Design a protein around this ligand. Structure first.
Ligand code: MQ9
Ligand code: SF4
Ligand code: SF4
Ligand code: SF4
Lengths: 395, 118, 407, 121, 183, 191, 124
């Protein structure tokens, strides 16, 4: 009822919660070590390459090889950097990334060695916003790495990280609201339980889209990989970083990818419930299979990430922020209002009045957004005048 | 339909189901063109005599000064090519050779050819 | 005042600057206030090094200048040599057709490289790989025809270094068949892509007056709507007999230039189709043996070499043949003294060549007015006042190949 | 209680990250070089130690207005979470209350937008 | 680094082997094309080949992350300072691949403007002929560099190898003195 | 750091939602304050913190310390007088309880927060937003007007490149050997 | 004490030529000269790192790593680095010798008296 379920959470023996934390840590490490190689190979395929396929069998060790190489590489500390913050920034990026994933439901209750415990490190009454807070703290690593490096390109990268926050933070916060509204809680276990009837992706599609866009932004992934923007700022904020400090920045980014995709699964795709083809199968939602389904959904989001990288340029961060404040925020806010009214009407028996509203509202939005797209702006044309430099005649 | 702007996705997805096109070098090296300007090679007549007569025409034509040739006399006690001259020393500085092929066009005996080995 | 503006180097070593181009930007936070341009980080001494080599040998140098447009540089050089010799009217038809075919396939290749590098500069990573798949399709034909992938020395004064291999025509027909489809695959990534258009529409704007003032040519000029192409005005190498449309745009910005390049690829495919249509067997070298390149390359079991027939001719039978081979290979033709400025429509604009001969076997002067060098005068115009990310898009749109810039 | 697992995961992460930085600094070659330690400027010599008279001391941002608006909007949007979670328990009264509040926020937003506040970045 | 202060026994040997394996398998290039050879380097990264296969997809834009420098072009005089700055700004260990005749020895452009080999300004690990070297040749040279990296000593072994190489190098007669059949 | 710590304390005091919102909102707020520090104060400016008002530093230290001591004295021992745990309140949902209070008893204050938001927006727009008159010219605009930025020194001359000196601050050399003022940007202090 | 001069070149004949231009005692008003010869950049760098050298002569034409690159490196990497003299294989290389920051540059072929005078100027 009142999630977190008090009969499941907060009763682990010290060793068992230690082991669950360790397992989550190792799972995130292996997930990142996978995502690296899988992303490179999938990008290769999307570009008709093979990607890494030599280092170790089938190229398995390539991510591990890169990690160990960065470990074995000289630890640079450039002069002209704020040494303390220059060394802290990777830590500030890493710690919150790992912390956020604590309240992610990787499964339902299971009886490990007699102890009935969740396949989830823990859960909080405000878990979703706790993840949001951890991710927000994580951006300080990016910004302070940019600033403390004392070089123009890292400085610009860090400023782009600040702008990135200004773009995605409010959109993400608003996107959470509709899920809270249909769930009646902020715990992730409660949000998954509330999705037994149906996944909120079908119900809260606008919220899902806004959250996913703000997500791709939050992790600094293409087409919003602006803080790095190798094509503009060379290496962005992680210029001036080498070896395990750069490796920590990138591991933090990939763990943020994993955390936000796991949240997306948790609060829009039934969390760990088996998809439809296995929904009818006995015990598909029990034992360890929920872990498989959760990882499958998370990795579909990972695929979406890689696919975005392989098929889109990167916006200018001003364009992205204009997206966030002119499309994402208005759409999320109006969706929150529409969904609230819809639920109030359904609870008041109005019935059709809600359906007429809901369908109409999006229909209106889909128009006015196109208005800001083609039908009213961003699709105009002009001319110009010549100067005194004896210009030719344009046919 | 706004779908055209998304055509790129259709591309990338499609390509991740068509087979990769990479040549499998070095386990399965690709087919270089028959005409490729590979490593110069000094050839022989069927009886084994060296074709090169040491005329230095190949080195003459090299824009990069990447060929060094010293000619020397063929004699009964020691004959390397038919005729009075042969290339006793024949060096190619491959850190100056630009693979242009002018040497080949210069050579009057076909002693110098370009293989496809690279 | 000062205190709010930083001065930064886009520098030589920067992913968007092709490694040897230095944009010194005075930026107010992140708006480009001034864009100084630093050049010569790729200067190679080609214009002087040429002077110590013969004609038909300087070709190997000139193809290295603008390494993305090798056939254009070589055609400009050899057309200059022929104009000096007065042999422009005697070149075989087949050599001219092959020249048009190779220049247009090179235009496709150069624009593919331009689009790839621009797209990866603007984050469109897959643009690089798709453009380079298409480019490799053409580079295989180049390798077959010339034996080299870049810096070909295939186009030579008075003709070509050799005739097409028997399979070449079928390779080019396959190109004409597939390039439309693969180019369409590339276009799906960029043409209508909302992020790509947003990234280049209205960006790097340059007025037709600006283009005239700086001497801009090529896609940058034609994005102003002016249908100025040296292939139609001032025809050369027989373009007069090819039906093709001068591609132009009205946007005057980066996206207009991009679309012009994408459409110029199609126009090149059309011209290549025409070339194959009007490619009749014949000599590829002027019949005047006093100037014709004497070598006849032919393959064998022992690799590419002089054809054994030629060896027999010059070493067993033909004394005058031997003398001509020896002298044209070693000393090379000597061109009558004089000057001539000959221009071609390189993919990046009016690639001009000032050629001066002192009656000798070595060129007295070969100056390349490379279009990229003049186009880089537009960095100030197309970058100042805009965003640095937009300046990257503008510079990419110029498509500067620094080899030609620095020569 | 109920938070000590989060603390264990945070401790694991912090030890991992601090030891990671320590390894970065400790493992692998180390050789002092003034050029290596100088700022990266795409290969060009970085400015004199006194960067310049004035110079990059202060970085203008073109979105200061949107940053200011972000402060207030981000804080003001947190009222929705308790409202969202308590929905179906507060009744139509709270629905109308938050609809009015969100209309007030919308008026603020529309004033900012239509008057070009969101435009300069 | 401490990894090199291990005792010269089996620990140091195995650490050397694993480190060489890893450094050869993750040999990220610097995004530092110069000329023609830069285009061929991009072609090597292109799908017809796949430099990514060898763990080298990441052309590192920042010198800090780059472990390898494919010079891949002609080093003019005005570029030698910049090229050296980029080299010195990579963090060790770092290797340099002189791609092309221009980078390796100046190539055809034996002139004032060209440095005549980056060896003048930076240590060269491997020289690669070609003008430009075709992508298969670039991959060959990179594999030769992989072989060089794997057989790399560390610590006391590194010092012993430096001493042995120095002693051997002092004896080789210079190229100009290797008069063979040259009269 | 202080905001994060206070958020942790709020969580520890049986106030989860308040602490989490603290972390979130103050992450945002301190990010913006950092941006404004970079804008208005400086990127790494090391302020003197030297007393400019005669003896003001000592007076401020004394007044602050005295006020702190007095407030501590006034607080004194309070918890010993009865500390009713919050369990009876958080039961049923900490956020649920906050929603009950905010939208039932404190509804009027919640409504007035909208007035606060609107006033902040109006202040930002009135004092910060700059209307058309001060709008910076567009790149499109700049290229125009007698072909600005290119007719004029087409692209201003690059800073000089010397052996041992290639930085942007280096002025270029004119044929006579003098230093070209145009090569070095206006803002740089010569060299 | 004897002065130690690091002569760097992979060409043995250039090293012998440098050792000939500079006798055991150049400018008899000066101390004796001790020669440590190195033919590899890593060894030259390590010897410099050992220190105690009064001058280093780096053949600008050294094959695997030029003496100009080593000169710039040693000036960037050794605190209190000894003055560097460079042998340049080309007159146009002078500019790079200026960039190498070597106190002097002596063009190839090594002119004995010119090299001796340059060294005496650096070691005085
Ligand atoms: C008996 C038994 C079963 C025992 C099991 C014991 C066992 C194996 C333990 C598991 C738990 C572990 C690992 C504990 C040990 C302690 C520990 C965690 C140490 C960490 C040390 C450390 C900080 C670093 C050393 C390496 C390491 C293993 C670190 C963690 C794993 C990883 C993957 C970290 C960093 C690597 C990483 C994520 C990024 C590297 C940087 C990049 C750019 C990656 C590659 C890459 C990317 C990502 C691109 O974006 C890209 C795009 C386009 C083209 C190419 C690329 C490209 O190359
Ligand atoms: S290879 Fe040919 S051109 Fe060269 S010396 Fe021998 S015979 Fe003469
Ligand atoms: S390929 Fe060209 S550069 Fe190389 S040896 Fe032959 S003629 Fe000389
Ligand atoms: S070596 Fe040849 S292909 Fe490579 S950059 Fe130099 S000229 Fe171009």
């Amino acid at each position: 009822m009142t999630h977190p379920d008090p009969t499941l959470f907060g009763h682990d023996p010290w060793w068992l919660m230690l082991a669950k934390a360790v397992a989550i840590f190792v799972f995130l490490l292996l997930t990142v070590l996978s995502a690296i190689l899988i992303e490179r190979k999938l990008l290769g395929r999307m570009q008709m390459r093979f990607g890494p396929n030599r280092v170790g069998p089938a190229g398995l060790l390539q991510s591990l090889a890169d990690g160990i190489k960065l470990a074995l590489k000289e630890g640079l500390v450039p002069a002209g950097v704020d040494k303390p913050i220059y060394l802290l920034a990777p830590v500030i990026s890493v710690i919150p990334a790992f912390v956020a994933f604590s309240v992610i439901p990787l499964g339902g209750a299971v009886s490990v060695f007699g102890h009935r415990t969740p396949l989830q490190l823990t859960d909080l009454p405000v878990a979703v916003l706790f993840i949001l807070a951890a991710t927000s703290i994580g951006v300080y690593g990016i910004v302070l790495a940019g600033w403390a490096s004392g070089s123009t390109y890292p400085l610009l990268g860090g400023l782009r990280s600040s702008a990135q926050v200004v773009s995605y933070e409010i959109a993400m916060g608003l996107s959470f609201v509709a899920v809270f509204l249909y769930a009646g809680t902020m715990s992730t276990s409660g949000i998954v339980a509330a999705q037994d009837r149906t996944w909120f992706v079908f119900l809260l599609l606008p919220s899902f889209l806004v959250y996913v866009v703000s997500m791709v932004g939050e992790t600094n992934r293409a087409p919003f990989d602006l803080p790095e923007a190798e094509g503009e700022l060379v290496g962005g904020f992680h210029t001036e970083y080498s070896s395990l400090k750069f490796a920590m920045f990138m591991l933090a980014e990939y763990v943020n990818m994993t955390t936000v995709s796991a949240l997306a699964t948790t609060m829009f795709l039934g969390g760990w419930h088996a998809p439809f083809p296995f929904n009818l199968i006995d015990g598909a939602n029990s034992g360890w299979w929920p872990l498989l389904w959760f990882t499958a959904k998370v990795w579909t989001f990972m695929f979406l990430y890689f696919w975005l990288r392989a098929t889109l340029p990167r916006l200018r961060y001003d364009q992205f922020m204009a997206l966030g404040w002119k499309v994402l925020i208005p759409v999320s806010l109006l969706w929150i209002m529409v969904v609230a009214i819809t639920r109030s009407l359904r609870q008041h028996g109005e019935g059709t009045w809600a359906a007429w509203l809901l369908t109409a509202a999006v229909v209106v939005v889909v128009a006015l957004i196109w208005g800001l797209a083609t039908s009213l702006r961003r699709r105009t044309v002009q001319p110009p005048p010549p100067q005194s430099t004896g210009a030719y005649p344009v046919p | 339909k706004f779908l055209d702007a998304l055509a790129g996705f259709a591309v990338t997805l499609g390509s991740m189901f068509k087979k990769p096109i990479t040549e499998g070098y070095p386990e399965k090296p690709g087919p270089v063109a028959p005409r490729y300007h590979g490593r110069h090679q000094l050839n022989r007549y069927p009886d084994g005599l060296e074709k090169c007569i040491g005329c230095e025409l190949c080195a003459w034509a090299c824009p990069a000064d990447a060929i060094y040739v010293e000619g020397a006399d063929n004699t009964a006690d020691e004959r390397y090519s038919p005729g009075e001259r042969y290339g006793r020393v024949y060096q190619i500085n491959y850190l100056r050779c630009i693979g242009c092929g002018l040497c080949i066009e210069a050579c009057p005996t076909r002693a110098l050819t370009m293989t496809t080995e690279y | 005042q000062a205190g709010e503006r930083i001065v930064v180097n886009m520098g030589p070593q920067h992913p968007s600057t092709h490694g040897v181009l230095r944009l010194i930007l005075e930026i107010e936070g992140e708006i480009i206030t001034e864009a100084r341009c630093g050049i010569g980080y790729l200067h190679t001494g080609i214009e002087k090094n040429l002077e110590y080599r013969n004609w038909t040998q300087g070709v190997t140098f000139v193809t290295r200048m603008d390494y993305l447009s090798p056939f254009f540089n070589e055609t400009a050089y050899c057309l200059g040599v022929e104009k000096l010799l007065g042999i422009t009217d005697d070149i075989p038809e087949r050599a001219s057709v092959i020249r048009v075919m190779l220049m247009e396939l090179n235009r496709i290749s150069s624009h593919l490289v331009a689009l790839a590098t621009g797209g990866m500069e603007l984050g469109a990573m897959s643009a690089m790989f798709y453009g380079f798949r298409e480019r490799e399709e053409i580079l295989r034909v180049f390798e077959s025809i010339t034996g080299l992938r870049m810096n070909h020395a295939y186009i030579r004064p008075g003709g070509l270094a050799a005739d097409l291999p028997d399979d070449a025509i079928t390779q080019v027909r396959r190109l004409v068949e597939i390039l439309p489809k693969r180019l369409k695959d590339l276009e799906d990534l960029l043409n209508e892509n909302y992020i790509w258009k947003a990234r280049t529409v209205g960006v790097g704007y340059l007025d037709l007056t600006g283009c005239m003032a700086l001497g801009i040519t090529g896609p940058i000029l034609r994005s102003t709507g002016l249908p100025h192409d040296l292939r139609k005005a001032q025809p050369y190498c027989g373009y007069e007999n090819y039906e093709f449309d001068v591609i132009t745009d009205d946007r005057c910005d980066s996206y207009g230039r991009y679309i012009i390049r994408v459409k110029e690829m199609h126009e090149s495919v059309k011209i290549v189709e025409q070339c194959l249509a009007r490619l009749k067997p014949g000599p590829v070298m002027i019949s005047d043996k006093k100037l014709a390149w004497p070598a006849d390359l032919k393959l064998g079991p022992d690799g590419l070499g002089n054809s054994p027939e030629h060896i027999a001719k010059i070493m067993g039978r033909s004394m005058e043949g031997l003398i001509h081979h020896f002298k044209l290979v070693t000393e090379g033709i000597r061109v009558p003294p004089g000057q001539v400025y000959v221009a071609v429509e390189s993919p990046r604009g009016e690639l001009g060549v000032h050629m001066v001969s002192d009656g000798g076997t070595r060129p007295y002067r070969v100056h390349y007015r490379d279009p990229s060098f003049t186009n880089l005068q537009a960095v100030a115009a197309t970058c100042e006042g805009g965003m640095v990310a937009d300046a990257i898009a503008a510079v990419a749109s110029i498509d500067p190949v620094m080899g030609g810039v620095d020569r | 209680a109920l938070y000590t697992p989060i603390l264990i995961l945070g401790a694991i992460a912090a030890v991992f990250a601090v030891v990671s930085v320590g390894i970065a600094l400790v493992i692998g070659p180390r050789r002092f070089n003034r050029s290596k330690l100088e700022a990266y400027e795409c290969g060009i010599d970085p400015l004199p130690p006194v960067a310049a008279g004035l110079t990059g001391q202060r970085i203008p941002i073109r979105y200061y207005l949107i940053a200011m608006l972000f402060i207030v909007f981000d804080i003001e949007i947190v009222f929705l979470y308790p409202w969202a979670v308590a929905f179906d328990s507060l009744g139509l009264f709270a629905v109308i209350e938050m609809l009015l509040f969100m209309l007030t926020v919308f008026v603020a937003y529309a004033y900012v937008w239509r008057r070009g506040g969101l435009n300069w970045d | 680094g401490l990894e090199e202060r291990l005792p010269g026994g089996i620990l140091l040997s195995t650490v050397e082997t694993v480190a060489g394996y890893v450094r050869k398998g993750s040999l990220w290039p610097a995004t530092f094309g110069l000329a023609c050879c830069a285009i061929e380097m991009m072609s090597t990264a292109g799908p017809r080949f796949d430099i990514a296969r060898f763990g080298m997809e990441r052309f590192s834009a920042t010198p800090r992350q780059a472990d390898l420098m494919i010079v891949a072009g002609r080093v003019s005089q005005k570029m030698a300072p910049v090229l050296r700055q980029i080299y010195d700004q990579m963090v060790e260990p770092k290797w340099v691949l002189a791609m092309g005749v221009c980078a390796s020895s100046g190539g055809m452009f034996n002139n004032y403007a060209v440095v005549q080999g980056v060896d003048h300004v930076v240590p060269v690990d491997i020289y690669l002929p070609g003008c430009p070297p075709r992508p298969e040749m670039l991959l060959h040279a990179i594999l030769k560099l992989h072989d060089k990296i794997q057989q790399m000593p560390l610590g006391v072994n590194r010092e012993e190898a430096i001493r042995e190489a120095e002693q051997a190098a002092l004896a080789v007669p210079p190229t100009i003195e290797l008069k063979g059949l040259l009269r | 750091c202080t905001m994060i710590s206070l958020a942790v304390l709020y969580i520890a005091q049986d106030a989860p939602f308040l602490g989490v919102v603290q972390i979130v909102v103050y992450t945002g707020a301190v990010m913006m304050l950092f941006l404004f520090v970079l804008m208005l104060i400086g990127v790494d400016l090391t302020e003197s913190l030297v007393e400019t008002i005669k003896g003001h530093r000592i007076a401020a230290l004394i007044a602050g310390a005295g006020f702190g001591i007095l407030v501590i004295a006034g607080i004194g021992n309070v918890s010993v007088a009865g500390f009713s745990g919050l369990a009876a309140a958080n039961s049923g949902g900490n956020v649920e309880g906050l929603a009950a209070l905010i939208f039932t008893r404190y509804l009027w204050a919640f409504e007035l927060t909208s007035a606060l938001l609107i006033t902040a927006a109006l202040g930002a727009m009135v004092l910060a937003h700059r209307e058309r008159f001060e709008r910076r010219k567009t790149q499109r605009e700049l290229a125009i007007e007698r072909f600005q930025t290119g007719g004029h020194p087409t692209p201003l001359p690059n800073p000089g490149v010397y052996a041992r000196h290639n930085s942007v601050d280096v002025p270029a050399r004119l044929p006579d050997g003098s230093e070209s003022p145009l090569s070095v940007s206006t803002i740089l202090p010569h060299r | 004490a004897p002065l130690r001069i690091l002569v760097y070149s992979d060409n043995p004949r250039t090293r012998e030529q440098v050792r000939l231009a500079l006798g055991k005692r150049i400018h008899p008003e000066l101390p004796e000269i001790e020669y440590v010869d190195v033919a590899t950049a890593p060894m030259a760098i390590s010897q410099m790192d050992a220190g105690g050298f009064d001058l280093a002569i780096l053949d600008g034409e050294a094959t695997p790593a030029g003496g100009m690159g080593v000169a710039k490196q040693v000036k960037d990497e050794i605190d209190d680095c000894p003055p560097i003299l460079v042998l340049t294989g080309r007159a146009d290389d002078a500019w790079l010798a200026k960039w190498s920051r070597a106190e002097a540059a002596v063009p190839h072929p090594i002119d004995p008296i010119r090299l001796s005078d340059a060294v005496v100027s650096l070691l005085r």
